[PDB]
DNA sequence: GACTATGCACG
DNA sequence: CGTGCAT
DNA sequence: AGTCATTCATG
DNA sequence: CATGAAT
């Protein structure tokens, strides 16, 4: 009825369990797909349930509950919150979930409850899943042990850098800023050609973070420190403009603010400066933002030092802040502080495994089919004899042994023939079969080449990454300075 | 409780009474903050024809309306000291939406008649389909569909253009036509006595 | 830009719109299957999803989310709350949902939240859904116009009386207590035989309600009244016993309490009597209910008038309460107050429709095949020339045409023939086919008779009902007095 | 907050500290009213090794264990005045359950050493499996000869709870004993204390990510 | 249907 | 302090 | 993850 | 005042 345990030998076991789990399978991203497990489950699940960009929106609660019943044994609210975030275009550079309804705002206010909103995968997230049906990625069992789920996704683009991550575990934490899709691909593509590229050359392609919120990034030197070691301190400052007004008064207008900053609160803290007369000359603060543009008007008084006021807001509010790179991620089951190079290499590494796996899958499919198509071509020239032979057989199995023995068809061919539907005896035309045979041969040749030549496989990897760039590429939002 | 307009202006300023926090939030986003305030109604509004004026006044939704409109209640009610030119009841195009419009209206008739007889109380007409259509009639005529289960799944861009934009919006004006035919109606549908309501329901509701 | 409408008119369309809906489509049960639309959707969805008594439990949230996305467009909470209720065996005489996890108690504490619990349909619930897949009940479109849902269930047992309903609408309310499955069926069977049965006779079989919480129901006169008009007021009193304790003191011991009564709040209120000494004599009040028994000891003082106390608790607490029948259900889309008679009429009429519909369905299947099977028997008589015709035909279309024209096969046979797999040509056995022809002919005769003879049909109804009773029958819990 | 035992008796009575309301509800239902109390811990418990004694005395749960066990906190802690001779920690078998235990223990250690050291602080071992019941994958496969994977406490049904974990007869129960004051002070600070570096180290040294 | 407080690491 | 997956 | 209020009819 | 589907 009892059994004693040491307080040491027990906090040891208990905490080690929580430690490991919350590090591997909760708070930190996989280095290759750039996803935390919950994020991966949401994606994999919605995809299985056919809830994609090309098809209707699906009531959010339906997706959440399915995720919870099949893959993620945790709170409906955690799952939804995660799902909501993936859909906010001020947190993700490239949103992975599109959502109908109130999904929040930069004012930090709450999204509509899960019963109100509809959602589906964005078109680009589909590229995170591309080729999953093709045995291209290691699966594992879910908690039920009733269904298999992916441990990583195929990632047809480098999501760790593009969307970022953040990031609180046990003993480790992670902060990775978002990046411009095209810049990241341009980098990756270069490194494919140049395995030993060094940070400086890579920075000619990937100059730095690109925040969805825009604004100005200052600190080339630190960006490099970050891209090199995983840590770095950089300055983000809001995008401002000065409008002149009637009555000789000038006015500061804010149009982009720093990533991860709450517009509503920022506005209060600025108005708080005015209230407390901490700097001389602020008339009134107004959030003038509306459904299609961010705009904070800070109207000054007549005869007021406009540069004085702007410098104070930068120093003493969040009009300007420090972003801290702390790029940690999960590489070979372990938390690892990493810079631009282990990241991109790990990605290329992974995209290689996927493409090869894919091509093996497709080759096998094509071989099998070619094999059947070869037999069907033969069968046509002996159509009548084959019918006669089947008529002469006692049952299906006997028909096959007859087909083999008498015409040297193979099991797989004989089964194919014997299970043809009668009406097929009317499409007796060799030439289209001979055209399929040819397409099939070519296809196999192309895949064998991928499989048996690293240069050919990387060239595929480059063709493909460039297609993704052409398709989803967009302009920088954040500008740089040193 | 409420999200207010930026400038005080009893001549343009509008109050939007929105059914639910969900829509309450999509309106905050969709609106024009200069002259448009949002007041969420979270839950089914009390019935001011059935409840004791004791409770009627100890009610959060009811207090923050008397107090957000700033004219006071009953006959202590000064239309001249109002806070909004318009007062808009924006509910889901469902039945409970209908029910909420119903409870609000009886409160504005029972306790702020000046407002209803002055033509300041309106009711928003959200679209039912997506061009946009409001009637199953103007739909197939638009067949030359995203059925809105509620204001929820509409997006601020859409909500503005379709129903909050003073230039693009349809908007019902509530108007007392026959004072006595109106008091009878209200008191049958919303009053303490069940039997006449049932009668009314039988006489008027077509179950087919 | 703006349209005026009368307050009288606006309040008209609004209240009519809502009144009709909350009556027809929310608060009141259909008179045949006894379900409110929310409950039907729960059962139909879980059933569609194969979440049934014989298979693992699903996470409640998976179920809830599916219901919400396909059928019932409302609170995930209301849906869950409804689902939880159909699983509490102290609210439903015969529970339709089995739930793993904290789903409540008679103490009326909250059930575990949707994220914790697991559910599946009960075996009996399956009987409510029986034959749903055989086009036995009218379907409509869901709120989406994307999927058809059933409007009433086949109801292989008279759920409306067995389980009850309750019951708040507009202009109308409902309170129908639960009854013993065996008694209800006995009456339904008697009425099948004697359509014109009088309430007095029916009550020889269905003597009164049977609460799952047992207790004592007093009022034969009013039970009758209620079964005649749908309204009646009855008394429900707790099962009690007196236990003599060590030297002079007695103990009132409660073992069954009135339906719809919260054990915890009762025990409190009985103790509030002791604390206020409204009546003299109570020493202590002890809820002693464990996990497998209900027991409330009311320990009395020495020389305490134990009738005086028991009478006082009966009057001034819920140790005894009045239950009010107000049986209103939906019959022909209309609210309707009804007694025991029209209720069983409706049930029986309904089961008639179901059994008719069901038999038409099975008969159409047996026929479609018997038709194909006839054709195949013919083909064997002329295999060589039928193969020859397909050989000679231009395509599937043409082949079918020639089969019709040259040998008078019908489209449906021509389609069967032409889509046979080649290995079928091996067979020459007409006998097996002839055996199948015979079995099919017999099956159609039996089905045709049910469809064409009111009596044959009704004996089926009776037979099936009796099977349901033999299987699910359970003893009375509530005793009757007058 | 707390569901009390029907009869005071600082000699038999037990305190069940349960992770979350759902399982706290099942515990209310499954218990033996006469001597078993339930105190639901709703949410993750404050870290008494990291946080400032100010915030600590202001933490709802902490205050309602001190004022429930009725012996005050710290060196002002009178063992002889405890209300239960058995304080039982009942968590899910998941990792966050393992976490809660970790946090509760560092509380009693830091603020009621007298209690842990008198062998009065316990941890309930619930079953992982049911096919009978099994507690460890090993004990499991032996029953597979001559499997409802309990996802957590809120999925067990009150009569099952009682039989496997709460019934003093049919239940397995860890007793938390201190064996090395100093070696069990070092282990608590590495793991639960302000400084992050030592903890990061300990993980790298002791956790096999394989 | 929003709200309340914890863990965890990091400036 | 605030972040985001967890209780 | 529990809590708070309201509708609607009925005794 | 409590009931059970709804905001
Ligand atoms: N003792 C705490 C006071 C605040 N609080 C929360 C909470 F604020 C949020 C949440 C949540 O947001 C939340 C969620 O599912 O998202 C869950 N809980 C519960 C811990 C289980 C929360 C709890 C826990 C109950 C009481 C505690
Ligand atoms: N004005 C009311 C204060 C308490 N309250 C509730 C509530 F108590 C329960 C509930 C629910 O139980 C509940 C549910 O979905 O089950 C929903 N709400 C919200 C009205 C939408 C509730 C609300 C509404 C928000 C505020 C109102
Ligand atoms: Mg939460
Ligand atoms: Mg700053
Ligand atoms: Mg609605
Ligand atoms: Mg609720
Ligand atoms: Mg009474
Ligand atoms: Mg858990």
Author numbering:
A (entry chain B), C (entry chain A): 3 to 484
B (entry chain C): 415 to 544, 556 to 569, 577 to 640
D (entry chain D): 415 to 545, 556 to 570, 577 to 640
Can I see the authors' text?
Quinolones act on type II topoisomerase–DNA complexes to prevent strand passage of the T-segment through the cleaved G-gate in the topoisomerase cycle. Quinolones trap the covalent enzyme–DNA cleavage complex, preventing DNA resealing and triggering cell death. The upper part of the topoisomerase complex consists of the E-subunit TOPRIM domain formed of four parallel β-sheets and surrounding α-helices. The WHD within the C-subunit together with the TOWER forms the U-groove-shaped protein region into which the G-gate DNA binds inducing a banana-shaped bend.
As part of our ongoing structural and biochemical studies aimed at new topoisomerase-targeting therapeutics, we have focused on topoisomerase IV–DNA complexes with ACHN-245 and ACHN-454, two novel 7,8-bridged fluoroquinolones developed and produced by Achaogen. However, they differ in having a heptacyclic ring system formed between the quinolone 8-position and the 2-position of the 3-aminopyrrolidin-1-yl substituent at position 7; this seven-membered ring contains a double bond in ACHN-245 and a cyclic ether in ACHN-454. Moreover, we report the structures of the topoisomerase IV–DNA cleavage complexes with ACHN-245 and ACHN-454 at 3.43 and 3.24 Å resolution, respectively. Within the S. pneumoniae topoisomerase IV complex, a 7,8-bridged quinolone is hemi-intercalated into each DNA strand and stacked against the DNA bases at the cleavage site (positions −1 and +1 of the 4 bp staggered cut in the 18mer DNA) as found now in many other Gram-negative and Gram-positive topoisomerase IV and gyrase complexes. The carboxyl at quinolone position 3, besides interacting with this magnesium ion, also makes interactions with ParC S79 and R117; the lengths of these interactions are similar for both drugs. The amino group on the 7-(3-aminopyrrolidin-1-yl) group makes key interactions with a cluster of two glutamates and an arginine (ParE E474, E475 and R456 in ParE) through a single oxygen of the carboxyl groups of the glutamates and the main chain carbonyl of R456. In both cases, the cyclopropyl group on N-1 of the quinolone is cocked out of the plane of the quinolone. The stacking interactions are very similar, but the cycloheptyl group of these Achaogen compounds projects towards R456 and D435 and if modified could form a scaffold for substituents which could span towards these and other residues and impart further contacts.
